[PDB]
Design a protein around this ligand. Structure first.
Ligand code: HEB
Ligand SMILES: Nc1ncnc2c1ncn2[C@@H]1O[C@H](COP(=O)(O)OP(=O)(O)OP(=O)(O)O)[C@@H](O)[C@H]1O
Ligand SMILES: [Mg+2]
Lengths: 560, 588
């Protein structure tokens, strides 16, 4: 369980709320054990006293303990629940922040390796780690402390009897949970195998339903899928076949303690040949003490899941980020001139204020040029300079301000239209915010619940043409001297494509625009067109220069 | 009764429980046996304890009551073991039937509806959410039957020995439902909405994780940590306000089980001292009656205190029943299933007259369509994205219902039986899916009983055999989940090989060469151009320059066919096609 150490240390932020919740859980159990033990002794003590001992019994002192044990149990249970639930929501909040703060400095590179379903495990693993306190730590620590307090306090009467009740209770806290976790390991492995095989077969049956029904194979794959459910439901049964045994044995152990207390305390308690009332003290302590052990066997099974979720999160967060940003201080320049040298070793100079287009064919060559221009990973090839200075010398706070990126995949957050644009500029007037929506031709989004309509999962899914316009709105809001266009006007119709290109030229006129495109629309406006294949610039120049020299750009315009 | 969503979902949960009433009745019968064995266990312990404490009898003389006490403990552990294996069966046979109902409905709806949600969204509904209901049926429902059998059976046992001790337990019996009616039921539905906010807060964290690439390039790392902090703290504060009311039920039940144990001890304690002379039946009060009442006083409230331990079993089944109840009740418009059958296997002729294509929810996908495709003539669909091109191919496959007239060889498509109509059909489709196990089974999906020669002929004709040596095991390579071993260019050729294996009357090709390599485009269209001349073909594409030889072109915009004709006349006409061709030729 050494995998839990990075997350146990997260408990230091709330170690008084977390430890109070455990204390209130122990105090409630000792009031349950105390009240029934004191009730059992009071009956036997007053029975043997009889009427003749009415005046000399002193029943006021037990009554003050019965009153206190009922209040302690009543209030302890109410605050056990409140404190331990408050603390569970505080642990989850600090786990979500810790996971996010460790996954962001390695955002593009570390998680690159299906990133869609990786995050559903991350979200589910943080939830499972949140269970370590109430589902695992609180029952196991509470049971151990309750057993010792009973064992210690009950030994002021008879050491032999206290140790044979605590010894039985300590044996089944330390020996019984591990013996059942080990017993069901073989079935718990066969249960995870068949669950992910059913998910694999189900998903392939729903995703390929058009192919399966057309080719007449939908019924015989539903059969194979419903046979994996039968195997899965049998592995689930054998897992309950063992949980039904861990609950019957816990009943027999707690029955053994009562039999032993009835038998062993019959001979004598301490030096007393006939214990009298002390027989019921030990029997009624053995009856109530095994309610503290009820959660522990199931609290150890879930410990295997919490450990498994702990290594998965630690495998991600304990990675080395590919880029390290120096902690220096820089003033963002109003004009950025970008120059590159030997990055399969391409060199280009982009003067401040001029636009540039890159004509790489997709697939034959992927432009990771914009990815290392935003420091997603360091360029092993050579040097990248920003405004006659190395890009690596800029701290992250100023690197972001000096480059605005419109990524090919526009992310629409589950948030209002205002929250999707205050992303770009942290503080923008509610009217200055609304002006950009009109400029980029997104006044339709202003028609109904403008700047308050929920976007994303909650509703209002944006179309491709309207979602490209939103990325440009973010770039225009986030005023940066250098703009990196990552394949804009791709997948859009001719009307929208021409609308965005004219929007790009009119709105971004005093900005250094570096565009990566595989189209040819509107490249006359761009000066110094760059054409490259597999990271090798064939030639370059303005629109007229390429046509005159009859290079590769000339045959592109000829349809060849 | 009650109009809250908590009670409406809980009513649905119980209606699904009649699938395994047989097991929920055995578990109820075994709860009466648990109540009887609890009372017998307490009566032996009280009878033993009286002999030792009052009569001073050595333990060796009480070998018969000790023996009977051990059997009662052994039988109790047997019933507990039996009652939980029976309990599992009740949950399992309900989830099997609900999972079968979800798969039946999601198969009847067809691919037109399954593609409305991601594949992982359906697996959550089928695996996680159906399984979230197991503990409600295996644990919570049996325990809520135990909470009325054992407490009532405890009282009937202590009544003959001492009626005053029976009133102490019985007096607290109606107060617990009384608290529920007043303030407990109100907080139960408020809790149901906090579990929705906790699931909604989990999607706010997943959203910030899915968009870390966007937050990184905008320098919003520190401002989303604060956004996470504020959302988390907002949830906790609102949830803790409700949980102050919801945790009173756990506190009140602990107050009544503490007051009743205290009252039993106090009343019996003073009855022995002579201060109180009521409650017994004039036969005198004994120590055995006191221990029986005191041993059974915790067990009177134990079924109710254990029902609060199973709270999340009900809370997560209601959250699952929230999603399964709407799924099973969303109105779906299934395309009409006919009884007709196509006469021959020759290429079919398609005629559409005022045809409208309707999605399962009811939305119109393709507007008025009027076209005719004589037998054996290849046709091309072109247009912008979202112009309804796939809807026409979905309708011809039988996946979407249509309001107009769409006749196959003079027979309406509604009247054609889908089982036999789809044997005369072969669709390559957009975003192809290889749902078999290995690459030999994906090709042989069209007919598994095919000779090895035809398998090789189909693999050669589709240019799949040329990259087979690159695969480790060859034709027996396992493609795996979503064909991770095959690239999108070479997984697209296996789809072609599957389509061409069987003869067909109509071949539908939807964006076959879209999003492939420059080499896989050549190989796919080389096979599909030659395979389109053997029967009636309807292809959807944006490779407008290659399609100079197809018989007819349908330029489709806004769900309607706005231009028809051959490529020779449409290219130079200057209409909708020329704009599309001009736009396409910009791509390099
Ligand atoms: C708001 C809503 C809610 C929520 C969210 C929650 C969330 C939660 N939770 Fe809860 N609970 C509740 C509401 C709730 N809850 C209640 C109401 C109760 C009471 C019940 C009784 O009576 O007992 C509890 C109770 C409870 C408990 C105790 C009992 C048992 O043992 O079973 C526990 C442990 C828990 C854990 C938990 C967790 C871990 C979590 C995380 C997820 N919890
Ligand atoms: N099952 C569906 N339910 C609801 N709307 C749908 C459904 N399928 C398609 N649509 C919508 O109907 C319109 C036409 O979509 P369709 O997929 O038929 O177009 P397409 O031209 O084939 O698409 P693409 O350009 O992506 O190939 C669009 O608005 C689309 O999002
Ligand atoms: Mg389509």
């Amino acid at each position: 369980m050494r995998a839990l150490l990075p997350y146990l240390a997260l408990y230091k932020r709330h170690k008084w709320m977390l430890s109070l919740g455990i204390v209130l859980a122990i105090v409630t159990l000792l009031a349950s054990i105390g009240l029934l033990t004191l009730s059992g002794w009071f009956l036997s003590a007053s029975a043997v006293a009889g009427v003749a001992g009415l005046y000399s019994f002193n029943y006021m002192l037990p009554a003050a303990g019965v009153r206190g044990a009922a209040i302690t149990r009543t209030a302890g249970r109410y605050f056990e629940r409140l404190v331990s639930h408050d603390a569970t929501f505080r642990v989850l909040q600090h786990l979500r922040i810790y996971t996010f703060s460790k996954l962001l400095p390695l955002s593009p590179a570390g998680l690159a390796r299906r990133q869609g379903e990786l995050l559903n495990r991350v979200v589910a693993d943080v939830d499972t780690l949140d269970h370590l306190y109430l589902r695992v730590i609180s029952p196991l620590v509470g049971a151990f402390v309750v057993i010792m307090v009973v064992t210690i306090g009950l030994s002021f009467l008879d050491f032999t009897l206290a140790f044979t009740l605590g010894g039985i209770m300590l044996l089944t806290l330390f020996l019984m949970p591990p013996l059942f976790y080990r017993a069901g390991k073989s079935t718990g492995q066969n249960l995870t195998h068949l669950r992910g095989q059913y998910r694999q077969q189900l998903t392939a049956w729903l995703q390929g339903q058009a192919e399966l029904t057309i080719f007449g194979a939908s019924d015989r794959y539903r059969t194979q899928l419903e046979n994996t459910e039968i195997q899965w439901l049998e592995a689930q049964r054998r897992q309950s076949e063992l949980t039904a045994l861990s609950q019957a044995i816990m009943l027999l152990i707690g029955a053994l303690a009562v039999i032993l207390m009835l038998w062993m305390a019959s001979g004598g308690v301490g030096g007393n040949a006939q214990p009298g009332a002390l027989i019921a003290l030990f029997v009624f302590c053995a009856l109530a003490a095994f309610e503290a052990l009820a959660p522990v066997t199931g609290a150890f099974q879930h410990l295997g899941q919490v450990i498994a979720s702990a290594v998965r999160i630690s495998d991600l967060t304990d990675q080395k980020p590919e880029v390290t940003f120096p902690d220096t201080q820089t003033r963002v320049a109003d004009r950025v001139s970008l120059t590159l040298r030997d990055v399969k070793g391409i060199s280009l100079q982009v003067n401040a204020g001029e636009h540039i287009a890159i004509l790489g064919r997709t697939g034959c060559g992927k432009s990771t040029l914009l990815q290392q221009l935003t420091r997603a990973w360091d360029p092993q090839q050579g040097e990248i300079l920003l405004n006659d200075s190395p890009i690596a010398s800029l701290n992250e706070a100023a690197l972001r301000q000096t480059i605005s990126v419109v990524p090919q995949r526009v992310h629409l957050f589950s948030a209002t239209l205002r929250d999707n644009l205050l992303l770009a500029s942290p503080g923008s007037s509610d009217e200055a915010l609304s002006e950009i929506l009109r400029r980029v031709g997104l006044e339709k989004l202003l028609e109904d619940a403008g700047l308050n309509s929920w976007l994303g999962e909650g509703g209002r899914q944006l179309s491709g043409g309207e979602l490209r316009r939103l990325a440009i709105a973010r770039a225009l809001l986030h005023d940066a001297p250098l703009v990196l266009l990552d394949e804009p006007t791709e997948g859009l119709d001719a009307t929208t494509e021409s609308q965005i290109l004219e929007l790009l030229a009119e709105m971004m006129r005093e900005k250094t625009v570096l565009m990566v495109t595989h189209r040819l629309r509107g490249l006359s406006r761009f000066q110094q067109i760059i054409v490259m294949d597999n990271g090798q610039i064939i030639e370059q120049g303005t629109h007229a220069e390429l046509l005159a020299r009859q290079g590769r750009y000339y045959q592109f315009k000829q349809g060849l | 009764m009650n109009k809250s969503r908590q009670k409406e979902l809980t009513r649905w949960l119980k209606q699904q429980s009649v699938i395994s009433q047989r097991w929920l009745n055995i578990s109820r019968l075994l709860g009466f046996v648990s109540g009887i064995l609890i009372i017998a266990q307490a009566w032996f312990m009280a009878r033993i304890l009286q002999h030792m404490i009052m009569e001073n009898i050595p333990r060796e003389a009480l070998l018969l009551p000790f023996t009977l006490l051990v059997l009662t403990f052994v039988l109790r552990a047997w019933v507990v073991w039996l009652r939980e294996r029976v309990g599992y069966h009740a949950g399992q046979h309900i989830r099997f039937a609900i999972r079968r109902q979800v798969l039946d409905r999601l198969q009847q709806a067809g691919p037109a509806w399954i593609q409305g949600k991601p594949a992982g969204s359906w697996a959550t509904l089928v695996l996680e959410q159906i399984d979230d209901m197991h503990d409600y049926y295996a644990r919570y429902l049996p325990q809520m039957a135990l909470a009325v059998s054992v407490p009532l059976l405890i009282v009937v046992a202590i009544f003959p020995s001492n009626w005053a001790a029976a009133l102490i337990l019985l007096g607290t019996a109606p107060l617990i439902p009384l608290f529920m009616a007043l303030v407990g039921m109100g907080a139960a539905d408020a809790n149901r909405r906090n579990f929705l906010a906790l699931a909604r807060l989990s999607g706010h964290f997943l959203d910030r994780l899915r968009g870390m690439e966007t937050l990184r390039i905008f320098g919003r790392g520190e401002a989303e940590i604060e956004s996470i902090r504020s959302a988390s703290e907002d949830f906790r504060q609102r949830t803790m306000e409700v949980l102050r009311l919801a945790f009173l039920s756990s506190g009140i039940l602990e107050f009544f089980t503490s007051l009743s144990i205290a009252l039993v001890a106090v009343y019996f304690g003073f009855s022995y001292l002579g201060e109180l002379d009521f409650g017994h039946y004039d036969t005198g009060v004994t120590l055995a009656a006191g221990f029986l009442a005191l041993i059974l006083a915790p067990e009177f409230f134990q079924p109710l205190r254990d029902l609060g331990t199973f709270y999340h079993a009900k809370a997560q089944a209601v959250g699952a029943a929230d999603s399964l109840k709407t799924f099973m009740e969303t109105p779906l418009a299934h395309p009409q299933r006919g009884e007709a059958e196509l006469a021959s296997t020759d290429p079919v002729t398609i005629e559409a007259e005022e045809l409208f294509i309707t999605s399962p929810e009811g939305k119109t996908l393709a507007g008025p369509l009027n076209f005719t495709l004589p037998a054996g003539q290849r046709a091309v669909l072109v247009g912008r994205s979202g112009s309804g091109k796939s809807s026409l191919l979905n309708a011809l496959s039988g996946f979407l219902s249509y309001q107009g007239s769409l006749r196959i060889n003079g027979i309406e498509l509604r009247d054609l039986s889908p089982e036999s109509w789809r044997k005369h059909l072969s669709w390559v489709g957009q975003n192809p899916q290889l749902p078999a196990a290995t690459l030999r089974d994906n090709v042989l999906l069209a007919r598994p009983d095919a000779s090895e020669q035809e398998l090789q002929a189909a693999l050669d004709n589709a240019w799949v055999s040329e990259f087979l040596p690159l695969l480790p095991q060859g034709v027996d390579t396992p493609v795996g989940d979503q064909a991770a071993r095959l690239s999108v260019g070479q997984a697209q050729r296996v789809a072609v090989a599957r389509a061409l294996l069987n003869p067909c009357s109509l071949l539908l090709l939807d964006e076959p060469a879209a999003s492939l390599d420059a080499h896989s485009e050549q190989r796919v269209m080389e096979a599909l151009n030659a395979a389109s001349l053997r029967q009636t073909t309807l292809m959807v594409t944006h490779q407008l320059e290659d399609l100079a030889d197809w018989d007819v072109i349908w330029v489709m915009q806004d769900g309607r066919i706005i231009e028809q004709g051959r490529y020779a006349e449409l290219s130079v006409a200057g209409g909708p096609f020329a704009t599309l061709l001009a736009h396409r030729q910009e791509e390099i």
